[PDB]
Amino acid sequence: AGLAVELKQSTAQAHEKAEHSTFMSDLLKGRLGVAEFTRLQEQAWLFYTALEQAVDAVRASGFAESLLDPALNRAEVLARDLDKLNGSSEWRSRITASPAVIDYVNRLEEIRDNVDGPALVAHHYVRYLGDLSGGQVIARMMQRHYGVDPEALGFYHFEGIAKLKVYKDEYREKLNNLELSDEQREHLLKEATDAFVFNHQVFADLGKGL
Numbered sequence: 001a002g003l004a005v006e007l008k009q010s011t012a013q014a015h016e017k018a019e020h021s022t023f024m025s026d027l028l029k030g031r032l033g034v035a036e037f038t039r040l041q042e043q044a045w046l047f048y049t050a051l052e053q054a055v056d057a058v059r060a061s062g063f064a065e066s067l068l069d070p071a072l073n074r075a076e077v078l079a080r081d082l083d084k085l086n087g088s089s090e091w092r093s094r095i096t097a098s099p100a101v102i103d104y105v106n107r108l109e110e111i112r113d114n115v116d117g118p119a120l121v122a123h124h125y126v127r128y129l130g131d132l133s134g135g136q137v138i139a140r141m142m143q144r145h146y147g148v149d150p151e152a153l154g155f156y157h158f159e160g161i162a163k164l165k166v167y168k169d170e171y172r173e174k175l176n177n178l179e180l181s182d183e184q185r186e187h188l189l190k191e192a193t194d195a196f197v198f199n200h201q202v203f204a205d206l207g208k209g210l
Ligand code: COH
Pocket: 004, 007, 008, 015, 018, 019, 024, 028, 125, 126, 127, 129, 130, 131, 133, 134, 135, 137, 138, 196, 199, 200
């Protein structure tokens, strides 16, 4: 199968397990609240910041350029959401990475410094295609259960993308058309599994003490 299908199939079980995370399932079903949603978004800001440094380095090396669309960048959008959610900008210098986020950020920094294009594409798929594909569902559950205002849910909307269904189709085709040696393809597929694990661990840390 093409790369896009192999990525979907190889991470499908991990995706189901993510939906059934105690923390995330509690958040989505309305058992938590805006503050816990804000805690999630703070951790996400930390890992998206690192992810986007790795994207920038890999794009600058000339690898996967058409996939690495800067319109996908989420860190600054997330920061605007968090300014609203937290009521001030102080969180920027106060939040601390959980142990899982330290691990995730460390890997993204390794990918940046090694300019590991195939690994970066795996992380790009796991975060951005998931955001493009499922973000609207998550945002709607925060609005409905907790009354989060849409202005604090900008992370879940891609302003620079006019035709979302078309964009997702074109993204998958770019994955299919990415030239990869056998070794690079195996490295990318393993990395996608690892990226799901890191994301699952973020939820586990957020759930501590609940
Ligand atoms: C409950 C909502 C929910 C959660 C918690 C969730 C948790 C996560 C998560 C957390 C660790 C990650 C890394 C992802 C990553 C992805 N999600 Co979701 N997703 C979610 C709702 C969706 C929806 C909706 C889609 C589109 C397909 C579908 O199953 O409806 C989705 C699709 C994806 C895709 C695209 C698959 C493909 O077409 O190849 C990726 C990647 N994801 N997702």
